[PDB]
Amino acid sequence: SGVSSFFGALAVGLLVLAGLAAAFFAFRYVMRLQSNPMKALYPLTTKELEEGGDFDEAKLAEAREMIRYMALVSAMERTEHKA
Amino acid sequence: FADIDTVIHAVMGIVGGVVSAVSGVSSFFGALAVGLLVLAGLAAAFFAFRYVMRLQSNPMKALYPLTT
Amino acid sequence: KELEEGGDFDEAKLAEAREMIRYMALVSAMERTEHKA
Amino acid sequence: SQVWFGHRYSQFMGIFEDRAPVPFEEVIDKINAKGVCRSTAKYVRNNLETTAFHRDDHETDMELKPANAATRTSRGWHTTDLKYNPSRVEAFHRYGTTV
Amino acid sequence: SQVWFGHRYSQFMGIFEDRAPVPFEEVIDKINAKGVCRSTAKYVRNNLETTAFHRDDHETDMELKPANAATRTSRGWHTTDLKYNPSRVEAFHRYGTTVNCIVEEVDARSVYPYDEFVLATGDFVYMSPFYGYREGSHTEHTSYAADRF
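ok -> structure tokens follow
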């Protein structure tokens, strides 16, 4: 409490500004994963992104089903950590 | 024993003057302004932290909700 | 977990994973449209 | 008055009282000419110039009222009959000025 | 002085003034021996020991200056001519300390039985002007703790 009372008025204020800064930037990053993670998570390999026929419907159906089994991996990983 | 009449009225220039102004601005009222920003920072920290705790476990449900 | 002279690598599998990421992003965008509605 | 407020009481932490020399201009132009007296007091003291307001309010010319009656005393005139003390907010120091 | 600062003015919230008894050592060794007087004052008061600095600054021995002229008055000497008040930071309470050393010659008057006397300033000293240590002088009256004399 004496150390706190010490000057220090900049020290604690600096730590609080760094905490608000980390909270802000982390929060914005979370808001940027909540929407399309693969662009914000895999930027370089999702780079190239009018009349586009390159699309493959079956490939997207494969990716959909992959997500489900990927979630099944996560659950198995949860059980390992708990043990 | 004293002096009845005398009156005491009271780069580097940039920092000191600007610092004094902001310290005056801080002292301004403002008690709600800084408290509001601090509450928004604690709020962002809390919700972001909980989101991180929700990605740490099964991301695909919290990341791909509709297709899972 | 398991992560010197490693020949286990499969170049085509990585090329499959690259293309998967692109279509995975296409799922995310479709998910965004659902939430907005 | 540095008033401090408990839960069901109220203290005085300090009562600073001083005398302000009414300047020449205020005497000639307001008291003598108009019969009214200002509510702000500005003077030299301890080499630091000081300025004070009544009830921590804006400047106002106030009616000079005859002093209430007393025996074996010469005449006097004042403007304020009561002292100002700050309103109550709990567990705080609050300063209240009267002039 | 608890100075408070508005926007285009400056108030006094309080001006605490007290008198410090200059101790024996400072009188014998600095005023009498050297003719200078310190800038710090330490004394007992309200049972709480207190210590005070001049202008909230470090301790310094200061030149004893003759008091300015006046009519029908005995001599005096001081060290500080002006009061200290804190510099201005806005919307804050700031405390500013001044300490002035004063040596002043005065007259003294005692009436019978002479177990106490007065001074030209009007202070009653509660001790016989003849109380001391030599030839039954400890018989005389002093309502003071014997260490003070």
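Residues 1-149 of chain E form one domain.
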